[PDB]
Every structure is written in C-alpha cells, then in structure tokens.
Design a binder for this molecule. Structure first.
Ligand SMILES: [Zn+2]
Ligand SMILES: [Zn+2]
Ligand SMILES: [Zn+2]
Length: 85
DNA sequence: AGCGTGGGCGT
DNA sequence: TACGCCCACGC
C-alpha cells in the first residue's frame, strides 16, 4: 500500500494507483456516470449498471434452491443462506 | 428486502 | 489508466 490518500483528514493507503484515483472521488465529489433514465449521478460504472436495474426490473440472479430472482449477486448470496434456516 | 456505495483486484 | 466482478457494510 504505497499509495496514500493526501487528504489530511483521510487515512487510506492502496496497492495500485487506480485504486487511489477511484478513491479520490469521495473527496472530490466527482460522479462521472449519469443514469440515462433518472439523470442521477454515480461515482462508479459498476454501480451505475446495477442501479439501472431498479428502473428496468431486470434480475439476472436466481436462487438455485427456490428460483427467487435478484438484481445483484450479493443479494442472491445473502438469500441462499436462508435455506439452511 | 432493496439498494447506495466503498474496497480489493484480475484483467 | 479502465472495466467489471466479488465481497461487505449500512440504512
Ligand atoms: Zn481519502
Ligand atoms: Zn436511475
Ligand atoms: Zn432461495
């Protein structure tokens, strides 16, 4: 973690330069991705793709046990667990 | 439950 | 650099 955040309030260190650049955004308020539908702005590309799903209702991940659908895999993961109890 | 959003990192 | 996953936390 040879990359440190120069913001005198922030404590963060990163392994690559791109992690730092990305991180900077929290400091600068830069939200480079706009949702085409609601115009809302987002700091990341991946976050934008997942948020759009809220508009379209697209759910690419289904539970293997019950077939319940989710917009995100993390949502799926959180859910499969319930089948243990 | 739904979903914003940061961190780690393969590529 | 940039993307796009996973993974996790928080409300
Ligand atoms: Zn910082
Ligand atoms: Zn939107
Ligand atoms: Zn299920």
């Amino acid at each position: 973690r040879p990359y440190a955040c120069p913001v005198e309030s922030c404590d963060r260190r990163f392994s690559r330069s791109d992690e730092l650049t990305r991180h900077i955004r929290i400091h600068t308020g830069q939200k480079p991705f706009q949702c085409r539908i609601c115009m809302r702005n987002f700091s990341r590309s991946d976050h934008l793709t997942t948020h759009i799903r809220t508009h379209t209702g697209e759910k690419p991940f289904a539970c293997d046990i019950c077939g319940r659908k989710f917009a995100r895999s993390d949502e799926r993961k959180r859910h499969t667990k319930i089948h243990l109890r």
